[PDB]
Each structure stands twice: as structure tokens, then as C-alpha cells.
Amino acid sequence: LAQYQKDAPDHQELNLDVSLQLPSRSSKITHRIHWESASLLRSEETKENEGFTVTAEGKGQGTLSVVTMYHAKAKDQLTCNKFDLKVTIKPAPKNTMILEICTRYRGDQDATMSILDISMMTGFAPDTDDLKQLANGVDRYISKYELDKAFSDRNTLIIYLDKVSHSEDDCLAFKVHQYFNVELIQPGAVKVYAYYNLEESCTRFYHPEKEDGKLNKLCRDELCRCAEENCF
């Protein structure tokens, strides 16, 4: 038994030589799998998607895993996956318009506390009287910080909601006045989300009668150029 522990042999020899053999020329990536570095993950990347040949030789055992990373098209919505937002801006009956925002939670239960992040269009500002009327109770909240600012330099606003319904749309509206006049008006935006998760949000843009939120883009297949000026 003492001679058995003497003639005791250490470990089964591990020495793999794994060569990537490509018909084309690039560099020469060789791999020496030894006992001292058996657990070392040896990753080799290849940009062309193709059948190729792997040639291993030597004593020992190994595992080969070919895993290809890519970009897959997504049917499911990447933006506004958990919230529906519809924003409309219409001329009210000096230029004043009416902004209407209707949101609905896409869940089984009601949404909790949410944030309405409203950015004005360049040159427009909310009506002070209208904000105070929305802010009183009714499960809404506009901070004093927002309500005290003058009509000028009031281009951002945050309306706090105590909850938003999942059963139907909760809608609000208020008047917006044109305090600055510009030939090119930048579209405003509204962003709804729940306080416990900022990633699950929805953002819509508005521009006085310009479909959706988007600028005049020219798109085909993947590749879009800006078309936000005169045709010629």
C-alpha cells in the first residue's frame, strides 16, 4: 500500500491542440489546452456566418460551444410596451390651443403613482388658471414650484397622478398660450411612467397638426435622411 501511494500517478494527461482551419488567410489562432489552465475559457470570434472546420489533436477531453450573437427583429413593441398614450393638440375656440392627454395602463391591475412630463412647444406656455383647476384634488398634483412660475420661462411641467386606470383611458386637458413666435416650432412631448420603473415608459410628441410626433423624415428600408427644410 505504501508503494501504491508512491507509484500513485497524478492526473490523466490533458494537452489539447485545437486549430481553427479556415481556407482563407487571417492570423494563426492556435490553442494549447493544458492541465494548469484547463478551466480557462478560450473564446474565438469569427465575423463571417459560415460553415468551418475545427481540428483538435492530443490527449484529454474538452467541450466546443459555437454561439453566434446577432440582432433579431422584434414584433413586440420596444417603446410604450406597458402604457398607451394618445396626445392631441387643437386650436381653442395671440394664439391659444388645447392640449389633451389620454393614458391607459396595459396591465391586469391599475397602475400606481405616475408622472406626466410635459414639455411645451417652442413659444408656448400653459394657462395658469387651467393648471390650478386640474391640480385641486381629483387624484392629481402639481407642485407649488410649477404653479408659481410666470407664464414666461414655463416651458416644462410635471403633473403627478395618484393612479392611472387600466380599464379605460383617464383624460385631462388644459389651454396653452403662444408667448414667443418662431417660424420653426419645435414639437412638444409628453412622457408617462410609473415611479417604481423608469424604463417601462411611453413618450409622445405633438406639433400643431403634423401627424404623430415625428419630423418629416424620408425613410426606406433601414436608412433615413432628414427632410426638415424646403424641398428646394
Binding site: 478551466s39 414650484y145 410649477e146 410635471i158
Partner: protein, 215 residues
């Protein structure tokens, strides 16, 4: 001793770290050190064997992070070549992030909660920008009870408070605490802990920070 320049890194950035090589008297020495980079799964992905000689006990190294990578707690494992049984480690998180530009501090009045305190756990929220100036905004504070690793949120304890002059206060009432758990016997809560989560949003709505104080 391993020192990384930061605690968290984005995919693509370079990790700069120094290994200080001393003896049991903490005096700088020149020896050979084996370094292993290890992914959150546990598989070593980069081994190396360097020398501390002519380096005055300081060994400057760097490791490049691939673009496509698995997030989570990575590890650097070093050990002297002569002593492979004494393995020193440091972790660094890999994650996609942006700087919050401000800090939120959730500070309870006491470092504990007396089970028979009717006032409950009063917490002060202090938010200030990273350059010192205070922060005006709104904070959503919510409480929870932690039992080992099982967290039970208390929906009734949700509060919305104004952050005025960089400071706010929010109280978890004892009644809500007892009502949240489905056990009238308060003695069972002894041995458990409370955690507080606060989300502060600027009035501009351009930054949001969630912070937590558990245990």
C-alpha cells in the same frame, strides 16, 4: 491588495487596477503573482503571471472589457506564485449606466426601530447635487419588511412628499406596519428588519434617482 479605480464599469471601458505586493510585515517585496479574471458565472477568462520586481511593491495592470458581455459581479483573483492556497480577491460590477448627477440620502432618525414606538420610523430624505448645491423636487417613499431574503412590500406605506430645500420627512406609522403584516402579534417582528426605498425626481424631470437603506 487589489485596488480598482472604480466600483462599476460600462461594457467597452478599461479596468485599471493595482496589485500591492507586500510580506507579512507589510513591507513592499518583489515576487511573481498569478492573476485570474473571473466572470459572474465563475469561469476564469484571462490568466496571467507577472512580476513585482523593480516595481516598489506596486503592480499597475489593466483589463479591457468586451462590448458584448454578461452583466453582474466580476472578480479579480490574485495569489502569489509560491502560495496558490492564499487567494486574494476583489469584485467589480459591470453594468450599463449613466451618472445620476445628484445624490439621494435616506437617513432614519434612529439606526433601529423600537417595536413599541407608536411614532413609527421617521425618515429624513436629503437630496443634493454632486457639486454641493441642494436639490428641489419630489420624492416617492415606500417601506418594506425583510425576513432573511424574503421581502414583503407594504403598499399602504407609499407616500409622496415634497423635497423642499434639499430636505423631506416621511413617517411609517406603527398602525400601517402592523396592518401590512397578516399577524396581530407584534412580537414576531422582532428579529426582522425594515428597508426604505426613496425615488427623487427633479422638477425639470430630466433626472431620477432611486436609493435604498435596508437592514
Amino acid at each position: 491588495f487589489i485596488q480598482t479605480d472604480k466600483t462599476i464599469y460600462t461594457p467597452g471601458s478599461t479596468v485599471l487596477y493595482r496589485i500591492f505586493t507586500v510580506n507579512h510585515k507589510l513591507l513592499p517585496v518583489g515576487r511573481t503573482v498569478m492573476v485570474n479574471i473571473e466572470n459572474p458565472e465563475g469561469i476564469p477568462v484571462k490568466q496571467d503571471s507577472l512580476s513585482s520586481q523593480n516595481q516598489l511593491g506596486v503592480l499597475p495592470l489593466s483589463w479591457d472589457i468586451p462590448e458584448l458581455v454578461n452583466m453582474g459581479q466580476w472578480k479579480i483573483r490574485a495569489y502569489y506564485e509560491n502560495s496558490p492556497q492564499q487567494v486574494f480577491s476583489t469584485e467589480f460590477e459591470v453594468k450599463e449606466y449613466v451618472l445620476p448627477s445628484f445624490e439621494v440620502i435616506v437617513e432614519p432618525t434612529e439606526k433601529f426601530y423600537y417595536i413599541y414606538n407608536e411614532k413609527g420610523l421617521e425618515v429624513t430624505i436629503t437630496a443634493r447635487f454632486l457639486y454641493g448645491k441642494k436639490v428641489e423636487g419630489t420624492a416617492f417613499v415606500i417601506f418594506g419588511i425583510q425576513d432573511g431574503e424574503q421581502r414583503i412590500s407594504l403598499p399602504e406605506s407609499l407616500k409622496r412628499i415634497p423635497i423642499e430645500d434639499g430636505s423631506g420627512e416621511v413617517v411609517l406609522s406603527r398602525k400601517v406596519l402592523l396592518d401590512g403584516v397578516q399577524n396581530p402579534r407584534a412580537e414576531d417582528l422582532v428579529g426582522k428588519s425594515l428597508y426604505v426605498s426613496a425615488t427623487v425626481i427633479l422638477h425639470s424631470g430630466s433626472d431620477m434617482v432611486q436609493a435604498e437603506r435596508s437592514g
